Amino acid sequence: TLVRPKPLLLKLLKSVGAQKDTYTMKEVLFYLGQYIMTKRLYDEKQQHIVYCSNDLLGDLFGVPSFSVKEHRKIYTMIYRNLVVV
């Protein structure tokens, strides 16, 4: 499943080295994750928790925080920022 990220997500992916306009979900998650890890949006004590308030990611996802353990929720928010090819 190749997807085409909407402007805002494309901007975040490319901010961590992404170069294409089209990607597989695994590549999206990889860059999305390198973005979180690079910025250190996660909590040191509760490392599965992400704080993205006032961030590009918070804008993207529409939430102030989320847990990486909630896969369906993460998939939902990501899907809202891409069109499936």
What the block records as the tokens of 55 is 């961030």
Count of residues binding ligand 1MO (CB under 6 A)? 12
CB of 20 to ligand 1MO, least distance (A): 16
Q: Where in 7-66 is the site for ligand 1MO (CB under 6 A)?
A: 29-30, 32-34, 36-37, 42, 47, 50
Q: Which residue is nearest to ligand 1MO (CB)?
A: 33
Q: What secondary structure letter does DSSP report for 47?
A: T
d(CA 40, CA 23): 24
CB of 19 to ligand 1MO, least distance (A): 15
Q: Give the side-chain half-sphere CA count within 13 A for 3.
A: 20
d(CA 74, CA 61): 8
> Which residues of this protein are in contact with ligand 1MO, per CB under 6 A?
29-30, 32-34, 36-37, 42, 47, 50, 68, 74
